[PDB]
Every structure is written in structure tokens, then in C-alpha cells.
């Protein structure tokens, strides 16, 4: 089958609990993680999935493992503190990709961003240049918004994404009554 590693980042902030959009969509995207990890389990059960947040202090809840049994139990106690962090959130994952068991597995990291980026364009294009240098697949997913959806983020993705052929895809979800599951299941990255 397909050999790759899956890294999912969840937003522990209070912006996910807002009353306009979904009623604490954290559980919804949790169910998304569940159905996509069960999908990967059905396809290639030998894949491991790690879990960490975007907050200031990076704390791994569960190390990468093929068994999601205890992971489902570790999906709780999100510890709703902090706001957002980007750079070290990347450096705690992409640099930690070398701690995986199988060396034949491809590097794949996604993210759930529910908060505005505090970092300027410089750090963005630099980190994008780094990820492009080490050649790691990155899928940008943003749940909820305040300011304009894509402004510098477009150029960010374009500069971050190399190998136009069968490369990474950008996921942009607008406001709506529908869930995020079938919406993030639309690209080829899911299933």
C-alpha cells in the first residue's frame, strides 16, 4: 500500500467554541481525525499518527503509533490555554519527523488553524523556504476566520509548494451549515 506518516495539529484556543459557527467544532474535526485515521487504517494500518497542539508550549499527547486505541482516549483534555504559535509549532513537527520508526514512510504534515497568524511575511516565506528545502508535504487547513481569508497566504502556499505535478493541495472552507468532514474529504488528501 502507501507508506507515509500523518501529523495532525489541533487548535486548543477558545475561538473554536464561538457561537456563530459550529458549536465547539473541536469535536467535529475530532470526528474528522477519527474517520480519516480509520480510513488510513482500512488502507494501510501500518501508518502512525502523532498529536500535538499549536500553543506556546509544545506538548505531545501521543507519540506516533499504528494503534489509535489509546489515541482516541488521548483526544480529550485539550487544555484550552494559550492563543497561537507558528514557527516552533512547525519546528516541533517537521524536525521531529526523523523520530519515526519506518524510514520508507513519506513525510506528511497537516494543520488546523483557527487563529490569525501573528508572524509577519518574512517568517512565513523563510519557513516556507525551509519546508521547500527539506521537501515535506504540507496541507494548510483553516477553520474559521476574522480578517480576509487569503491575502499573503496565497503567495505563502505558492512559495511553499514545489513539484506542481501531483503536489500538495490547498483547502479553503467558507462559512456554512454543513460540517467540515465531507468538505475536507473533497480533496485527494483524504481517503
Amino acid at each position: 500500500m502507501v507508506l507515509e506518516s500523518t501529523m495532525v495539529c489541533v487548535d486548543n484556543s477558545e475561538y473554536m467554541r464561538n457561537g456563530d459557527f459550529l458549536p465547539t467544532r473541536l469535536q467535529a474535526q475530532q470526528d474528522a481525525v477519527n474517520i480519516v485515521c480509520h480510513s488510513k487504517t482500512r488502507s494501510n494500518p501500518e501508518n502512525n499518527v502523532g498529536l500535538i497542539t499549536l500553543a506556546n508550549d509544545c506538548e505531545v499527547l501521543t507519540t506516533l503509533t499504528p494503534d489509535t486505541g489509546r489515541i482516541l482516549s488521548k483526544l480529550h483534555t485539550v487544555q484550552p490555554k494559550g492563543k497561537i504559535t507558528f514557527c516552533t509549532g512547525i519546528r516541533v513537527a517537521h524536525l521531529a519527523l526523523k523520530h519515526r520508526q519506518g524510514k520508507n514512510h513519506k513525510m506528511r504534515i497537516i494543520a488546523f488553524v483557527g487563529s490569525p497568524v501573528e508572524d509577519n511575511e518574512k517568517d512565513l516565506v523563510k519557513l516556507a523556504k525551509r519546508l521547500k528545502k527539506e521537501k515535506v508535504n504540507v496541507d494548510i487547513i483553516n477553520f474559521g476566520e476574522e480578517e480576509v481569508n487569503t491575502e499573503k497566504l496565497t503567495a505563502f502556499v505558492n512559495t511553499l509548494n514545489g513539484k506542481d505535478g501531483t503536489g500538495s493541495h490547498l483547502v479553503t472552507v467558507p462559512p456554512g451549515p454543513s460540517l467540515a468532514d465531507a468538505l475536507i474529504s473533497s480533496p485527494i488528501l483524504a481517503g
Binding site: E14, Y15, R17, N18, G19, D20, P80, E146
Partner: protein, 374 residues
């Protein structure tokens, strides 16, 4: 009540619709966090505090049933409510309601009891308030050392400093206030009276002998540049010691109230200063001294020096015991405390000398020792 809110939201004063536009926009967007931010920005603005009685209660209710945003903001705005209305009667009921409404995730009970105590710091209650204050400071020894809550606690200790009961505690907390300083963003005009009552508390503080610790941190002397130098002069005089009684007499008669009864006590406090300074003056070259210099500097007779050194041994800052028969004065271990420049020069000097001596002896001995023994 959302569709019914539009009626009283639309109608407002002359300048209110300016912020009310963004307010109603964030209200239609149903953003609770942005709503709270807009509320704090509204409170930050110098409102007339007249027709805000409705929006205070409205935002109070909203903050009550939203169960999302940090309740501490609700505590702040309800403190503004009890500040504007000045009604301590329903204040207890409101605070109790806020304590009962909030669930248990993180503990805000420290700031809640801080607010309760602060409102109870009036002439109504004293002892029990001090007790629950002790409870508050005994609450969290854990990681949240942000000290902001402890800064509000320092304000509580200032309201406690309004009482003449304990001068020492406010100074011990003033050290914490001296160490928790962040930036200059806060008004200097307030810092004038702050450093003023700080100077008074430091001067009248019986829990401290030398004032050099207060003058040690650069922020105070940097913030006192605008203020008159009469305080800095006598503080630096108390720091470097007084060889003259004229200036300290001038600062003794400088402040009329409450300084008269404590004047002699301050004299008994600073009489040890010349002692510790003179015993910390010469580290070598005949440490042995006499009461002549002491009586000359402190302008006191030979009869009171026994009671003077008796008090010196009563405090416990000096272990000095003189075995003399004929008239003599022996000195002992003393604390450098704040700083000395000549003792730094002497430090590096004696240290360099000791080091090169140990090195010289080591090389000298080991020279033959390695050859004839090995």
C-alpha cells in the same frame, strides 16, 4: 432578546454610535471574543458614565450566559459597575452570583476573593479582611507567578498600608512591587505619589535598616528625575552613611506628621549604620578600633555607648563581642548588602594577591616535590 436588543442598541448618545457601529457589527457576527474586546475598549475610553447603566447590565447578562470568554473580564467590568454605582450592599450578592455561575476549569477564586477583600477594605471590616487576605496569599504557590494578581494584592496591601497597624509588611511587598516592574507605559504622574508613599513607607519601615536596597534598582532613581531631589539626596545620604547630623536633622524636621514620635527610633536605626560602615571600611591594617570615632560621629556621650552596643547586639546584625580590659573596641563579621566600590577594588586586589600567592607557593613546592618524590 437578540431581535429586541436592536431597539436600545440603535438609540444612543452623540458620540456613542461611533463605537456602537463596530459593536453591533461584532454583535451580528456573533463573535464573543471580539465582543469582549470591544467591551474592554469601551471601558478604557473616558465615558461619561451616565447612560451606561443599561449596557453594563446587558453585557453582564451576556457574559453570564455566554460561558465562553474569560470571566475575569466580567469581574473587571462588574468592578467598574460597583465603582460607578458605589453600592456595597448588592456587591456581595453580585460577586457571589459570579462565583456561583462560573464552573471549575481554571481557578479565578483568587481574583474573586481579591475583589471581595478589596471591596471589604473599607472602614466596615478590617480584621476578617486581613484574615481572608492571608488566605488569598496562602492560596496559590503554584506556577502562575504572573504577579499581576499579586500586584492587585499589592494594591490591597496599600489599602492595608492606609492602616498604621503594620508598616513592615507593606515594605516586604514593596520589594515584590520593585521586582515586578515591567515597563513605563503606566502614567508617571501616578508614579510620583507612588514613589512618594514608597519613600515614606521605606523611611518609616522598621523591618529594614539600610535604604540602599531601595536605591539599588535603577528604575526608581530614573523615575525620580522629574521629582524634586530632596528625597534622593537624603536617601543617598542614608545609603552612603551620614558623617554629619545636619542634613539628617533637616530631613527629620522635613516631614512634620508622624515623624516626630518615630524620630528617635529612626536615630536608633541609623546609629548602627555608621557602625557597620566603619567595620566594613577597612578589611585589614589594624581592624582594632575605639569608641572615640563612634562617639564623634554619633555625637553621643561615653555613657550611652554601652546601651548603644547593647541594642546593636539586641538586633542581632552584629556578633561583635569585645574581650578588652583596657579601653578598646573589637569588630566582627558584617554584611556588605547594597554595594561598595572601594571594597570591589579591594576584592579584586586581595583576590589577585591571594591567587598569585597560592600559585607561587604551589609552583615553588611542586617544583622540587615532583622531582624528588613524584
Amino acid at each position: 432578546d437578540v431581535p429586541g436588543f436592536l431597539q436600545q442598541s440603535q438609540n444612543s448618545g452623540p458620540g456613542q454610535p461611533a463605537v456602537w457601529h463596530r459593536l453591533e457589527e461584532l454583535y451580528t457576527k456573533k463573535l464573543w471574543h471580539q465582543l469582549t474586546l470591544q467591551v474592554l475598549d469601551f471601558v478604557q475610553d473616558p465615558c461619561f458614565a451616565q447612560g451606561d447603566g443599561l449596557i453594563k447590565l446587558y453585557e453582564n447578562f451576556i457574559s453570564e450566559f455566554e460561558h465562553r470568554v474569560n470571566p475575569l473580564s466580567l469581574v473587571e467590568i462588574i468592578l467598574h459597575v460597583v465603582r460607578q454605582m458605589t453600592d456595597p450592599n448588592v456587591a456581595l450578592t453580585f460577586l457571589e452570583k459570579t462565583r456561583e455561575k462560573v464552573k471549575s476549569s481554571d481557578e479565578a477564586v483568587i481574583l474573586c476573593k481579591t475583589a471581595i477583600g478589596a471591596l471589604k477594605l473599607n472602614i466596615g471590616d478590617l480584621q476578617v479582611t486581613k484574615e481572608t487576605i492571608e488566605d488569598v496569599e496562602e492560596m496559590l504557590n503554584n506556577l502562575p507567578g504572573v504577579t499581576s494578581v499579586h500586584s492587585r494584592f499589592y494594591d490591597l496591601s496599600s489599602k492595608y498600608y492606609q492602616t498604621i497597624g503594620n508598616h513592615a509588611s507593606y515594605y516586604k511587598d514593596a520589594l515584590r512591587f520593585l521586582g515586578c516592574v515591567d515597563i513605563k507605559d503606566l502614567p508617571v504622574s501616578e508614579q510620583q505619589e507612588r514613589a512618594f508613599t514608597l519613600g515614606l513607607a521605606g523611611l518609616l519601615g522598621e523591618g529594614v535598616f539600610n535604604f540602599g536596597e531601595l536605591l539599588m534598582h535603577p528604575v526608581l532613581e530614573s523615575l525620580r528625575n522629574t521629582d524634586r531631589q530632596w528625597l534622593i539626596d537624603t536617601l543617598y545620604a542614608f545609603n552612603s552613611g551620614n558623617v554629619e547630623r545636619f542634613q539628617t536633622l533637616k530631613t527629620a524636621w522635613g516631614q512634620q506628621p508622624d515623624l516626630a514620635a518615630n524620630e528617635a527610633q529612626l536615630l536608633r536605626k541609623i546609629q548602627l549604620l555608621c557602625l557597620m560602615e566603619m567595620t566594613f571600611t577597612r578589611p585589614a591594617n589594624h581592624r582594632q578600633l575605639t569608641f572615640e570615632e563612634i562617639a564623634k560621629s554619633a555625637k553621643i556621650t561615653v555613657n550611652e555607648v554601652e546601651l548603644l552596643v547593647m541594642k546593636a547586639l539586641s538586633v542581632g546584625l552584629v556578633k561583635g563581642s569585645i574581650d578588652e580590659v583596657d579601653k578598646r573596641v573589637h569588630m566582627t563579621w558584617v554584611q556588605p548588602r547594597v554595594l561598595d566600590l572601594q571594597q570591589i577594588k579591594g576584592m579584586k586586589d586581595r583576590l589577585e594577591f591571594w591567587c598569585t600567592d597560592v600559585k607561587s607557593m604551589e609552583m615553588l613546592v611542586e617544583h622540587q616535590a615532583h622531582d624528588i618524590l613524584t
